[PDB]
Amino acid sequence: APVRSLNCTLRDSQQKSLVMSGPYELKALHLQGQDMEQQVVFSMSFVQGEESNDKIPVALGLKEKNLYLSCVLKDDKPTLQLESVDPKNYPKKKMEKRFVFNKIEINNKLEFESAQFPNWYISTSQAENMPVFLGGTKGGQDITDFTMQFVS
Ligand SMILES: CC(=O)N[C@H]1CNc2ccccc2C1
């Protein structure tokens, strides 16, 4: 049948919210109050892929926009991009591998590993107003843990 999707927001474990940074980038910043309306709402789709109790393959589309987070090689490195799709063939159950993240639940937090690039994670910087990126370790100064908030 159809693919199943949930609307949600994400915050990093330092409780930074995600906002648009021009058309094809996200950035993370500390937000509260009125400015919370700026945060990106995701449509998280539950897609085809290798699955276990704590590791669930998802696509992170933007709610009612034909824009997906995707993992591609850029200037020879795994990078995070926002990619446009045909709003007539998405969202689907069999999403292409560049769009798939393994949503991993460890110690009441979420990590989003690239299915295409093992051990590369959706990441934020500690500094305010810096891009969301794909980082090649769930260790060090960069932040790889998130919480999800469910949206109506
Ligand atoms: C123009 C703009 O920055 N809008 C925000 C708020 N709402 C929203 C909803 C879905 C996906 C992204 C967004 C970002």
Swiss-Prot record:
GO MF annotation terms: cytokine activity; integrin binding; interleukin-1 receptor binding; protein domain specific binding
Record's note on what induces expression: By LPS. Transcription and translation induced by M.tuberculosis and a number of different M.tuberculosis components in macrophages; EsxA is the most potent activator tested (at protein level). In pancreatic islets, release is increased by high glucose treatment. In pancreatic islets and macrophages, release is also increased by endocannabinoid anandamide/AEA.
Annotated motif Involved in interaction with TMED10 C-terminus, positions: 112-125
One GO cellular component term: lysosome
Post-translational modification comment from the UniProt entry: Activation of the IL1B precursor involves a CASP1-catalyzed proteolytic cleavage. Processing and secretion are temporarily associated. (Microbial infection) Cleavage by S.pyogenes cysteine protease SpeB promotes its activation independently of CASP1.
Annotated consequence of substituting E128K: Increased affinity for integrin ITGAV:ITGB3. Suppression of integrin binding. Suppression of integrin binding
Cellular location(s): Cytoplasm, Cytosol; Secreted; Lysosome; Secreted, Extracellular exosome
Tissue expression summary: Expressed in activated monocytes/macrophages (at protein level).
Protein function: Potent pro-inflammatory cytokine. Initially discovered as the major endogenous pyrogen, induces prostaglandin synthesis, neutrophil influx and activation, T-cell activation and cytokine production, B-cell activation and antibody production, and fibroblast proliferation and collagen production. Promotes Th17 differentiation of T-cells. Synergizes with IL12/interleukin-12 to induce IFNG synthesis from T-helper 1 (Th1) cells. Plays a role in angiogenesis by inducing VEGF production synergistically with TNF and IL6.
Leftover remarks: The IL1B production occurs in 2 steps, each being controlled by different stimuli. First, inflammatory signals, such as LPS, stimulate the synthesis and promote the accumulation of cytosolic stores of pro-IL1B (priming). Then additional signals are required for inflammasome assembly, leading to CASP1 activation, pro-IL1B processing and eventually secretion of the active cytokine. IL1B processing and secretion are temporarily associated.
Listed name of the protein: Interleukin-1 beta
Included range, full protein: 117 to 268 of 269
